[PDB]
Paper text:
SNX27, one of the sorting nexin (SNX) family members, regulates the trafficking of endosomal receptors (protein cargoes) from EEs to recycling endosomes. SNX27 contains three domains: the PDZ (PSD-95, Dlg, and ZO-1) domain at N terminus, the PX (phox homology) domain in the middle, and the FERM (4.1, ezrin, radixin, moesin) domain at C terminus. The SARS-CoV or SARS-CoV-2 coronavirus receptor ACE2 belongs to type I transmembrane protein, and it owns a large extracellular region at the N terminus and one short intracellular C-terminal tail. We here established the interaction between PDZ binding motif (PBM) at the C terminal of ACE2 and PDZ domain of sorting nexin 27 (SNX27) and solved the crystal structure of ACE2-PBM/SNX27-PDZ complex.
In order to further confirm the binding capability of ACE2-PBM to the PDZ domain of SNX27, we synthesized short peptide (-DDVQTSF-COO−) based on human ACE2-PBM (residues from 799 to 805) and performed an isothermal titration calorimetry (ITC) experiment to examine the direct binding between ACE2-PBM and the PDZ domain of SNX27. As expected, ITC result shows ACE2-PBM directly engages the PDZ domain of SNX27 with a binding affinity of 20 μM (KD). Based on previous knowledge, the positions P3 and P5 in the PBM should be acidic residues forming an acidic clamp interacting with the conserved residue Arg58 in the PDZ domain of SNX27 and especially the acidic residue at position P-3 is essential for the binding. However, the position P-3 in the PBM of ACE2 is glutamine (Gln802), a neutral residue, which raises the question how this substitution makes the binding possible. In order to unravel the molecular mechanism governing the strong binding of ACE2-PBM and SNX27-PDZ, we determined the structure of human ACE2-PBM/SNX27-PDZ complex at 1.29 Å. The complex structure shows PBM peptide adopts an extended β strand forming pairs of backbone hydrogen bonds with the PDZ domain, and the overall interaction mode is similar to other PBM/SNX27 complex structures. Hydrophobic residue V801 (P-4 position) from PBM packs against V161 from the PDZ domain. Of note is that Gln802 (P-3 position) from PBM forms a hydrogen bond with conserved Arg58 from SNX27 instead of the charge–charge interaction found in other SNX27-PBM complex structures. The conserved Ser804 (P-1 position) in ACE2-PBM is hydrogen-bonded with Asn56 of SNX27, while, in other PBMs, this residue is usually replaced by hydrophobic residue which apparently lacks hydrogen bonding with the PDZ domain. Furthermore, the bulky side chain of Phe805 (P0 position) at the very C-terminal end of ACE2-PBM could form a stronger hydrophobic interaction with residues such as V57, F55, V118, and I121 from the PDZ domain.
Numbering used by the authors:
A (entry chain B): 201 to 207
B (entry chain A): 40 to 135
Write the structure that this text describes.
């Protein structure tokens, strides 16, 4: 799947 | 063509999101006539944040983080490399 992270 | 963007981290961060595959094995994609393994991409840019002001754009596909190749990498591998920057980040990207 696709995952997201905030920077 | 690939381009290189320097982003200096602010006290609130870099101001961008990254989205991509959890595990290896994603589909190949042709960009500018060149075939690439899966690339994590910039999925959002905070307006007025550090990445925005430095020229990072939504959809930018990440080839390298601090000159470490991340083509075909997992999401965690790319996340860990960005956090190892520690107040400075160099992204090599393919913009849309």
């Amino acid at each position: 799947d696709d995952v997201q992270t905030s920077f | 063509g690939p381009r290189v963007v320097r982003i200096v981290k602010s006290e609130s961060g870099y101001g961008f999101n990254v989205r991509g595959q959890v595990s290896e094995g994603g589909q190949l994609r042709s960009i500018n006539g060149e075939l690439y393994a899966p690339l994590q991409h910039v999925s959002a840019v905070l307006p007025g944040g550090a990445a925005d002001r430095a020229g990072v754009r939504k959809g930018d596909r990440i080839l390298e983080v601090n000159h470490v190749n991340v083509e075909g990498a997992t999401h965690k591998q790319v996340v860990d490399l960005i956090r190892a920057g520690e107040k400075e980040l160099i992204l090599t990207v393919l913009s849309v």
